[PDB]
Amino acid sequence: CPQVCPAIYQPVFDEFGRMYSNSCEMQRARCLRG
């Protein structure tokens, strides 16, 4: 889970219906919870 994410905006949706700007962000958020 990189501490940084690319500027490129790649909105993603999770099976929880949660919205994420990009996959990097997805991993980052999960990393904090883990």
* Amino acid letter, 15: E
Contacts of 27 (CB under 8 A, 6+ apart): 1, 2
Q: Other CB atoms closer than 10 Å to residue 25's CB: what's the count?
A: 19
- For the chain, where are the alpha helices, taking DSSP H only? 23-33
Method of determination is: NMR
The rounded distance, in Å, linking the Cα atoms of 9 and 6 is 8
Tokens of 27: 């991993």
Q: Is 11 exposed, middle or buried (0-12, 13-18, 19+ CB in 10 A)?
A: exposed
**What CA dihedral angle connects 31, 16, 13 and 25, to 10 degrees?**
-10
Cβ atoms of 28 and 2 within 8 Å: the answer is yes
